[PDB]
Design a binder for this molecule. Sequence first.
Ligand code: GCO
Length: 310
Amino acid sequence: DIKPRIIRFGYGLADDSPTGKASAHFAEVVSKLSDGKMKVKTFGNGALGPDEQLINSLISGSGEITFVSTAPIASLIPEFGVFDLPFLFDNEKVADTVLDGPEGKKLLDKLPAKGLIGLNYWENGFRNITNSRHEISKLDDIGGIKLRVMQNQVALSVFKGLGANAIPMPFTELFTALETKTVDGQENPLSTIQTSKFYEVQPYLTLSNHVYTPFVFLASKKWFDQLSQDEKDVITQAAADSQAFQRKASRQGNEDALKYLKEHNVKVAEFSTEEREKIREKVAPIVESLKAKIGKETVEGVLDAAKKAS
Ligand SMILES: O=C(O)[C@H](O)[C@@H](O)[C@H](O)[C@H](O)CO
């Protein structure tokens, strides 16, 4: 019980990013599972606007499918702000376990009230600081840096707390802000830094891995609800296939991105053990302060699930 249908899937990252390629994989599996009747059309590189517009497109129904970072969802469902807290997850295995577990599900379950279906979580990843003013090797080096952040009170508060001038901006305006030096820097996973070419305008990279961002793989509830059960199954089955593909592609892409950026002679720094503990001490107080704007129960439940998986 599948009728011919065309499905639009916009997103912000470049087409050849790992998640870009995972979106093409989703389209192929949807085709395969529906004998070519359900055709997904991918619009990468922000062609359908940034996360915030994609989100609104799905709620209204001009778009069907997207993936977005959790941070712009905090603007709808504040509990999603939890993932902008630094150092939540020690590694990708913990993140997978927590996100695929009850604490991840509790958050996804809040989406239908806002007109969205959270099909599952994909991996954006560990974020790393890039900038064009000077090497960042010490907490103090962040002082006064004009750093773009995702558009969220948690992201803004965290980096202001670390001494930056935190400048919320949509991802889709970021390359130009970096190139014109309207902003000194940004922070994102390595494969994004690479595939969106931020290295061409960011001579300095710090391997800080300070925050882990999930993507949410989203469907418009208005559109999803009008589908037949056989059609919903194609989408959810393809979503499960594509999550596994995405996460594997993301992790390989991280390894490849690091190699490329080093071989291309980007200047790479890290936070020493001493600097890392200075970071944590600065971080504790308004992590504590920010629980009230996220949701105490979400924060404590995520932190507990992460301990149990680690
Ligand atoms: O810096 C950001 O805002 C995110 O890290 C990007 O991954 C966006 O979510 C993009 O729109 C996803 O395609």
